[PDB]
Amino acid sequence: SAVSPMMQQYLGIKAQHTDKLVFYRMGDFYELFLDDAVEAAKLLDITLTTRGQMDGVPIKMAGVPFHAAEQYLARLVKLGKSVAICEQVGEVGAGKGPVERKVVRIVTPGTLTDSALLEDKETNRIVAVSPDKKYIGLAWASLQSGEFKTKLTTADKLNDELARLQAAEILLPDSKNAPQLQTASGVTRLNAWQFAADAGEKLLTEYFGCQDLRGFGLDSKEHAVSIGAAGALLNYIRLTQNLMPQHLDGLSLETDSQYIGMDAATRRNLEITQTLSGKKTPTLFSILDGCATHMGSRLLALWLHHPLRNRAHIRARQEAVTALESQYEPLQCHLKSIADIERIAARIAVGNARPRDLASLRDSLFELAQIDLSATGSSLLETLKAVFPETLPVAETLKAAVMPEPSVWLKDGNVINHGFHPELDELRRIQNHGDEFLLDLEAKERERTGLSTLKVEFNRVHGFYIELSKTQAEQAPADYQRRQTLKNAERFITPELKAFEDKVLTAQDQALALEKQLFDGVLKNLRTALPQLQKAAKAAAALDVLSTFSALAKERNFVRPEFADYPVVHIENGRHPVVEQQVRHFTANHTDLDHKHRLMLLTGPNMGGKSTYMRQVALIVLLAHTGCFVPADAATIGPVDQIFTRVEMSETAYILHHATEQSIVLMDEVGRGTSTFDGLALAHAIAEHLLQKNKSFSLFATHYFELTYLPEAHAAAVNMHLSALEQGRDIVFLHQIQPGPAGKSYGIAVAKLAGLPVRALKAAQKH
Amino acid sequence: GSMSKSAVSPMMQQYLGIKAQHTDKLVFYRMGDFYELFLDDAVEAAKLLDITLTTRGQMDGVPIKMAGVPFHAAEQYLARLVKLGKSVAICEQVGEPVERKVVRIVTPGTLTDSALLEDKETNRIVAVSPDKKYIGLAWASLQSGEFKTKLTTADKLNDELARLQAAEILLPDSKNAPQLQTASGVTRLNAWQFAADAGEKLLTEYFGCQDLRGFGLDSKEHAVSIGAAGALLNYIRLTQNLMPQHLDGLSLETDSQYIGMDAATRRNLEITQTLSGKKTPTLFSILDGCATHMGSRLLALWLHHPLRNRAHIRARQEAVTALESQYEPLQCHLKSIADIERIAARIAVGNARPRDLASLRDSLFELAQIDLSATGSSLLETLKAVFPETLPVAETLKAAVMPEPSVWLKDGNVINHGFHPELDELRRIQNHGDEFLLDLEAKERERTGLSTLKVEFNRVHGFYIELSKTQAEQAPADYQRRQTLKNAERFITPELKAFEDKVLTAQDQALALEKQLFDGVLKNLRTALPQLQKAAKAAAALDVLSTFSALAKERNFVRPEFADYPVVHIENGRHPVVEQQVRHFTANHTDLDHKHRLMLLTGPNMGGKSTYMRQVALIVLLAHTGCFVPADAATIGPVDQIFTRISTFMVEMSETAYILHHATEQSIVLMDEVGRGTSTFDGLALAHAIAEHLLQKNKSFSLFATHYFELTYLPEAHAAAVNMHLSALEQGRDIVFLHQIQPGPAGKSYGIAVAKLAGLPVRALKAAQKH
Numbered sequence A: 001s002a003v004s005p006m007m008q009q010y011l012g013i014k015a016q017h018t019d020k021l022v023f024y025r026m027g028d029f030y031e032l033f034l035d036d037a038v039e040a041a042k043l044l045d046i047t048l049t050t051r052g053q054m055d056g057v058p059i060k061m062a063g064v065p066f067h068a069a070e071q072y073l074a075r076l077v078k079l080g081k082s083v084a085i086c087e088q089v090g091e092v093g094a095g096k097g098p099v100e101r102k103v104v105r106i107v108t109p110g111t112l113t114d115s116a117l118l119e120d121k122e123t124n125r126i127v128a129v130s131p132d133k134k135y136i137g138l139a140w141a142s143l144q145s146g147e148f149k150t151k152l153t154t155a156d157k158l159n160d161e162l163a164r165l166q167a168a169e170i171l172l173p174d175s176k177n178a179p180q181l182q183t184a185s186g187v188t189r190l191n192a193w194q195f196a197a198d199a200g201e202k203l204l205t206e207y208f209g210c211q212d213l214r215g216f217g218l219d220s221k222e223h224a225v226s227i228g229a230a231g232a233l234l235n236y237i238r239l240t241q242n243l244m245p246q247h248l249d250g251l252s253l254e255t256d257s258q259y260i261g262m263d264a265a266t267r268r269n270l271e272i273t274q275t276l277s278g279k280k281t282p283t284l285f286s287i288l289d290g291c292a293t294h295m296g297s298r299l300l301a302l303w304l305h306h307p308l309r310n311r312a313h314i315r316a317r318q319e320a321v322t323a324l325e326s327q328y329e330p331l332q333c334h335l336k337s338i339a340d341i342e343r344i345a346a347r348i349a350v351g352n353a354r355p356r357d358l359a360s361l362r363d364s365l366f367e368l369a370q371i372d373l374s375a376t377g378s379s380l381l382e383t384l385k386a387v388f389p390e391t392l393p394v395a396e397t398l399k400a401a402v403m404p405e406p407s408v409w410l411k412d413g414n415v416i417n418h419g420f421h422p423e424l425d426e427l428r429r430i431q432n433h434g435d436e437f438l439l440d441l442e443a444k445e446r447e448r449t450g451l452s453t454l455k456v457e458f459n460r461v462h463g464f465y466i467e468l469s470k471t472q473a474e475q476a477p478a479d480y481q482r483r484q485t486l487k488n489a490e491r492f493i494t495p496e497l498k499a500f501e502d503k504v505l506t507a508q509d510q511a512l513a514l515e516k517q518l519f520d521g522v523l524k525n526l527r528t529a530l531p532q533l534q535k536a537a538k539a540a541a542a543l544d545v546l547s548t549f550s551a552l553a554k555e556r557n558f559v560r561p562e563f564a565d566y567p568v569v570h571i572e573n574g575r576h577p578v579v580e581q582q583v584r585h586f587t588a589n590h591t592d593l594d595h596k597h598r599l600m601l602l603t604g605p606n607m608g609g610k611s612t613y614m615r616q617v618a619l620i621v622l623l624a625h626t627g628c629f630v631p632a633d634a635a636t637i638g639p640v641d642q643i644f645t646r647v648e649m650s651e652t653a654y655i656l657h658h659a660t661e662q663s664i665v666l667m668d669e670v671g672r673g674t675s676t677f678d679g680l681a682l683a684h685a686i687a688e689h690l691l692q693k694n695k696s697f698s699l700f701a702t703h704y705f706e707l708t709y710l711p712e713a714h715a716a717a718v719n720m721h722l723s724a725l726e727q728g729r730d731i732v733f734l735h736q737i738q739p740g741p742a743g744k745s746y747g748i749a750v751a752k753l754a755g756l757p758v759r760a761l762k763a764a765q766k767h
Numbered sequence B: 001g002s003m004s005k006s007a008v009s010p011m012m013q014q015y016l017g018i019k020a021q022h023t024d025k026l027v028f029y030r031m032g033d034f035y036e037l038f039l040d041d042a043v044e045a046a047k048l049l050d051i052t053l054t055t056r057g058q059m060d061g062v063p064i065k066m067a068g069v070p071f072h073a074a075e076q077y078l079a080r081l082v083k084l085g086k087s088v089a090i091c092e093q094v095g096e097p098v099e100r101k102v103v104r105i106v107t108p109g110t111l112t113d114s115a116l117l118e119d120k121e122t123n124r125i126v127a128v129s130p131d132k133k134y135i136g137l138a139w140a141s142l143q144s145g146e147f148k149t150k151l152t153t154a155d156k157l158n159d160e161l162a163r164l165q166a167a168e169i170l171l172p173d174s175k176n177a178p179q180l181q182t183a184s185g186v187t188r189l190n191a192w193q194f195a196a197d198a199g200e201k202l203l204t205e206y207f208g209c210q211d212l213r214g215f216g217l218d219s220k221e222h223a224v225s226i227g228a229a230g231a232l233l234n235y236i237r238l239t240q241n242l243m244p245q246h247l248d249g250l251s252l253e254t255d256s257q258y259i260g261m262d263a264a265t266r267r268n269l270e271i272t273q274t275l276s277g278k279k280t281p282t283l284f285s286i287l288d289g290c291a292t293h294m295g296s297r298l299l300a301l302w303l304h305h306p307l308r309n310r311a312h313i314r315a316r317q318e319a320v321t322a323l324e325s326q327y328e329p330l331q332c333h334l335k336s337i338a339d340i341e342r343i344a345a346r347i348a349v350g351n352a353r354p355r356d357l358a359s360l361r362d363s364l365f366e367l368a369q370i371d372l373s374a375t376g377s378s379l380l381e382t383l384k385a386v387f388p389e390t391l392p393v394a395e396t397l398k399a400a401v402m403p404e405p406s407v408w409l410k411d412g413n414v415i416n417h418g419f420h421p422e423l424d425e426l427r428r429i430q431n432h433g434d435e436f437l438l439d440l441e442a443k444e445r446e447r448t449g450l451s452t453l454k455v456e457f458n459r460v461h462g463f464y465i466e467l468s469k470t471q472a473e474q475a476p477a478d479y480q481r482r483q484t485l486k487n488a489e490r491f492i493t494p495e496l497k498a499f500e501d502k503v504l505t506a507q508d509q510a511l512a513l514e515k516q517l518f519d520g521v522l523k524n525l526r527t528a529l530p531q532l533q534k535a536a537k538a539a540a541a542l543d544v545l546s547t548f549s550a551l552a553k554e555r556n557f558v559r560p561e562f563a564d565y566p567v568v569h570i571e572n573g574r575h576p577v578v579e580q581q582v583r584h585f586t587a588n589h590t591d592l593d594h595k596h597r598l599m600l601l602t603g604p605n606m607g608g609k610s611t612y613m614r615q616v617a618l619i620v621l622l623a624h625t626g627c628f629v630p631a632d633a634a635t636i637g638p639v640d641q642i643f644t645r646i647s648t649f650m651v652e653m654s655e656t657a658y659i660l661h662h663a664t665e666q667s668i669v670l671m672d673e674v675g676r677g678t679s680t681f682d683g684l685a686l687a688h689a690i691a692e693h694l695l696q697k698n699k700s701f702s703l704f705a706t707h708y709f710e711l712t713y714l715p716e717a718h719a720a721a722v723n724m725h726l727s728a729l730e731q732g733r734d735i736v737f738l739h740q741i742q743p744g745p746a747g748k749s750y751g752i753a754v755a756k757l758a759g760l761p762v763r764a765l766k767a768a769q770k771h
């Protein structure tokens, strides 16, 4: 009535998606209308205009070009918005008549697989949360890696798990909590019945082809909330991608004991993967990122955030890096030459993979087959040595199937190799007819009338065609009109080449359709081959990060960390990993902590370097529990469960919490603010909780001198410092750890002489 | 050293002739359409400017390294080179016939070209002549005619250097020269150029007077600064094409005319520069509402130089009060004037181009239109009296130059029509150009039967008529023939040789004539330089005062009051920069007298302590500039200096080491948490002693923020001390800071931050109480 049909179908699509933007394919452009038009013209800086009227109202519209579409929608998912992409799709091929217009894929900021949308070091996780009483169900998955885990956690404390997962999207039900909102990033809201164990268990069991989830360690009475979260995640993944991915790892209940505990503020303080200044310059991940492959880098981040508590999964890693120190160079001088086969396997699983990825996967897998000689170690890398079966006709029948240099698009043509399919072969051999047959009928009927020079014509409107001039007019052999338009050199169509295009045009029309058919065919080889791909990518990444761990333990002085059953922290000539590269003249120090030497009270002037030492030992323990070595001569670490580090952030209060038989707690000058009285009191009580009163093992830096007397009260809490000297008219710090307290101090290089005999006086009323 | 010159080309020998005079600078050697540098200059410029390094010719067998820049881009590269502190001699060829000359030396501190200066950029060169007992300072700004001398000391030197922000520093070459940071471009000079007697001769010559008494100098005690000024004048003479006669007077600066502030204080107060060194909201940027560039520069100068003489301050304030009701059309008028100050500078140094005059005359007329615009009663009346006095210059310029002259004087069409009758007649031979050529071509078509001939021209052959070799054989002997081509053949004929010599001769005479007339009006302008400088200064001052009036009207500023007794009274004042960043800013009072001299500020970390102190210091600074202050009312006593500190730790001991034995009864001192570092024993000892120095041995009005609570008990030991703290309120398990000064020391509430805490918090509550 008062709406264009081309708007009626659009509304038919938009009706199903009022919770995300809709890219609507219009010619060589993607366009959005109405509120999508205003919102898209706002989030981006896109010209807003008008095209058409609905009920007598000029409908607004914004547009982007097709060539720059993935860039713009990549900017849209960086903003945390979802976009449904609506194309015109037809049955059989090229639409044997009709065309449908439907949403072919839905792009969400947490289900990303294309290299055009992801940074080559981005980790993309979608986490679903299902809350209720105390415990809450936590389930996360990464499409690009196949990761798919679950976990039970407590209501709030969830924020630390969220900052640990670094989620790019959160799935949430309705009613009650959880809160935070802007402490996550981009939250999409799903129906409550999606989070039902009373449906989730069924969906999961069907997905993995098993009778129960007890094999994955998930019972039904407990865990129910988390199996429901996993079910909701599975549903979302199904609704977003065009194929249901069959590459997901396999459910596992993550225990809150298999990794060392690090809260959000601790992960930010130590600068594991990002700075406090919101960047990626000097982070622990950056100065260790010597991975030849992107997947190895991302895995390096994963290990950097998840150091394990088990005294059996590390030292295996030590048995790898130790056995790699004499063979790591020819491994990276080989791993540098492969591509992101992890994301490639992903795109094959979801179904958004283009031929270039098949080619690159073929090559990188063949190069993965050329490791061979570099092998033989202990336990784990004996598994990695055997994990490459070359990957059989998955690597072999990939070069046999796909060309060395395939086309960019499957609709351009020519992707499958020559001599791979016979009917294909005979259906190609008309590429010489651009040099034959038409030359035959074009020279045999070249100027059978004259004059003059004769040319040929392809044209898109009309079929194959021939040339002519102005004054030269009606000189034809068939002649019978069927001619114009228009004027200025005239044209008469021929009746016998309309049987020539009748076979070459159809020749390509069945060549490309067939090529799509068997491209889908050898695109199906996933019934047995997809897990092979996942295992290949996993082991390749692991070898990359481990060999990188071997390069760093020889180019820089790193030593195998030893372990112990008794709570101990000792290390000789310990160095800070990221600061060691910033000065080119770092001073190695030691730590000396045991059951009777557990708390260290640090003192010293400012630019002396106590923060650097604290972060030094903390990062050293972290690296020791990763598998890599530590910057030292030797280091011994007992058992440890959590690491804590420290606008009156009481979050010191967080130092409580489940299982406090810790071994590492950092406190840097707690007391700044309020006053010296109440600040000193709080620093005193806080310092006393860290020994016997509830907890154990701490590095306590403070300027409070009236607190250096604490070793006189508790023998387990010792006191050390860092000093300064000069050997001249200016004070310099060489940054050496020295036992005992402060302080001179002093000094003063010109502070008159009427405030000096009180600076020495009041600093002698040290009651 | 036996040498060429069969191993060096004559051109290269010329270049070495110029280069031997400038072994310390880059030399731009004019080479056709380019400026080229050779040898080490070529290598250095290749590094610095990212231009490709190449080779031209050979010297002593070795290829000559060369690097060039195109003429049209030269300025751009110069702009880079002076931003790297580099000086460049500009070798051109001059003559009537030609010799190689330097014509101009571009240095970081003698800039007058708009291509090499930002709009709001001050360009100062300062020469220091050290005696050791005292140090003479002389600074000049060519773009403003600024010329001032001062006697300082070695310990107070870097404070002056930081005050002046000089782009270039002239030092003597002696081994006893003062060691210092480097900084800006440091240029060392043949020590003899700092001579006191020679400098006195140079000054008395430049100004046309008998002695330097009127300026307040004379050779006895100011000798070293006289030598500094002499070095400055000599350097200006070496570097500029023409010797500028626009340097205003020469005042000896005393320590008693401006409110003194050290380098650290200028940096911390963020007057014209942030602590991160930007224009991210500073005092200048927040207050810069000037309509002219010269006005903005003057505003920066004023913000760095608050006046001690209250009479001048009050003259300014009268001006802004009078400008309250009339600053809108004033700003509209001044907004359409150009940088006549820099114009006068380029005229002075002999670097003005025709369109510069085309801006000077127009903006001078637009300034003459302000005679209405405003009235009133103050120093304003002098300012208004200045503008109509400069109308004659605008008239002579309206008569002498075109409404829009050409860019280059070498192209003619710069001198106006009707200004010179001989030029009008020489320029009149132009219809006789195209017209005669029509009355010739048409008289050759019918005469040769060829519509295939036109009169053509090139710079090599002149005018000619060309015919194809087919038609060439049929040409008359009336034609004369020259160039032999392939298809055609060119011919002149004496009836267009008379024409050719006629019009080309007229062109040359016209060009030379415009050259000499434009030069004439340039000499006249340079004689009118004092009135031009008065016009520029009057415009800039009026623009700054208009800006102050506008700020007071639109931001609720009030005229501060001045008292004869030590007092700082601010009825809820505001921080001028922070106030435009918070949507809501809480104003706060300040009551200080001889009995209340030291405020001991305490409290949490987000109660506006530092902002309050900076607010007080900034209102006192603004008070002595003529600008109205952000408050309901204010009253400040006699102030001499403003000290502040708002990494560690000897830098703290250094700044305090400056404050304790320099601050006086009239000083305003700001201390922000002194003691951070070392420990809480020694730091509290130092904070204690430092505090008991401002009330006692230098009765300065001090704001002293700290977290040492034991310093709270000073009002119970000193009548001068008082306790104030800033507000913190609990309204819903959540801390808020309403930022309000309250008498007293905030009490104890760090334990009260138990709003998110778990103890066993009594172990702290058992440490305090403890008295």
Ligand SMILES: Nc1ncnc2c1ncn2[C@@H]1O[C@H](COP(=O)(O)OP(=O)(O)O)[C@@H](O)[C@H]1O
Binding pocket: A579, A583, A585, A586, A587, A588, A604, A605, A606, A607, A608, A609, A610, A611, A612, A613, A734, A735
């Ligand atoms: N062992 C070391 N070797 C060399 N430089 C160091 C060392 N430890 C610290 N530094 C340097 O000393 C400076 C002060 O570091 P910081 O830990 O902040 O001191 P503090 O914590 O005592 O205030 C840093 O810039 C760092 O570069």
Ligand SMILES: Nc1ncnc2c1ncn2[C@@H]1O[C@H](COP(=O)(O)OP(=O)(O)O)[C@@H](O)[C@H]1O
Binding pocket: B578, B582, B584, B585, B586, B587, B603, B604, B605, B606, B607, B608, B609, B610, B611, B612, B739
């Ligand atoms: N009067 C005020 N009105 C509004 N905001 C203020 C005011 N004073 C301070 N603030 C804000 O409070 C913050 C803390 O200022 P600051 O004075 O540095 O606290 P402290 O001195 O306790 O360290 C600043 O970011 C400032 O913007």
